[PDB]
Amino acid sequence: VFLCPGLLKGVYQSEHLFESDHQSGAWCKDPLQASDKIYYMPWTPYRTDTLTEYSSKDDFIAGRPTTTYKLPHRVDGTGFVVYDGALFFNKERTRNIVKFDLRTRIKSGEAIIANANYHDTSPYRWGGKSDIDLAVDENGLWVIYATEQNNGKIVISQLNPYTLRIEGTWDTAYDKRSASNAFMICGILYVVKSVYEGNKIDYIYNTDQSKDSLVDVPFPNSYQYIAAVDYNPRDNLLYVWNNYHVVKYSLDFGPL
Numbered sequence: 555v556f557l558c559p560g561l562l563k564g565v566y567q568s569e570h571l572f573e574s575d576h577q578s579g580a581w582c583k584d585p586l587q588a589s590d591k592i593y594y595m596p597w598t599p600y601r602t603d604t605l606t607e608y609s610s611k612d613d614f615i616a617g618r619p620t621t622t623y624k625l626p627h628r629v630d631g632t633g634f635v636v637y638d639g640a641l642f643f644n645k646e647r648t649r650n651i652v653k654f655d656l657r658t659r660i661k662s663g664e665a666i667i668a669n670a671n672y673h674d675t676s677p678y679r680w681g682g683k684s685d686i687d688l689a690v691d692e693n694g695l696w697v698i699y700a701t702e703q704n705n706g707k708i709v710i711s712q713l714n715p716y717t718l719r720i721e722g723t724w725d726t727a728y729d730k731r732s733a734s735n736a737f738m739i740c741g742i743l744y745v746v747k748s749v750y751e752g753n754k755i756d757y758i759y760n761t762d763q764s765k766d767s768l769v770d771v772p773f774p775n776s777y778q779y780i781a782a783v784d785y786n787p788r789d790n791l792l793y794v795w796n797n798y799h800v801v802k803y804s805l806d807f808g809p810l
């Protein structure tokens with residue numbers, strides 16, 4: 555339902571929400587249930603099992619939650635998304651994605667991501683069990699991961715959010731442990747390279763005809779510990795967590 559904005563050509567600092575008390579974490583909004591609600595999951599090794607919901611940007615900055623969700627399992631890494639009223643996350647120490655319905659607060663299902671590396675086998679550059687990264691864009695729900703078969707290089711799959719089945723799979727040429735993070739826009743994977751305490755998108759992979767390219771799109775890295783970068787196809791922004799800081803970046807596009 556979202557129109558492709560084009561090929562990404564610029565990333566800009568835009569909004570700084572607050573400095574959190576966790577170095578790593580993720581946060582997002584649900585593009586398919588348009589509301590002001592913000593979802594928040596700070597990262598704590600072997601202790602992450604809660605999703606916090608805020609009703610607005612103001613409530614979020616003020617730390618006034620609407621509710622907390624106790625998850626049926628613990629979570630690995632910062633890769634979660636909320637999509638069409640359901641939380642998707644990587645179940646701790648598995649290659650499985652759990653779907654958790656927020657309105658009914660029950661586990662809907664579980665999917666095995668075939669042959670996916672997990673639990674600090676192929677994390678992003680900072681570790682944190684960030685092996686499996688969910689992404690939503692104009693073309694739906696995606697999983698970004700790596701496999702032993704693809705020599706630790708990023709693999710992307712389309713994940714049906716209704717049936718939890720994989721619907722398409724592409725092997726890329728990019729070492730996942732070399733990447734800081736990654737995200738999808740219009741079925742194109744963008745991989746971020748950055749310094750931890752160059753800063754750029756330096757690789758793209760287009761799932762339409764499976765063509766990849768080396769690029770150079772400067773990426774802000776003001777705090778030098780990128781933990782999460784997730785795209786939102788409703789507002790065309792990046793929701794970023796960087797060294798305690800919770801921020802949004804705006805995007806500029808050329809034709810695709």
Ligand SMILES: [Ca+2]
Nearest residue numbers: 687736783784
């Ligand atoms: Ca990501």
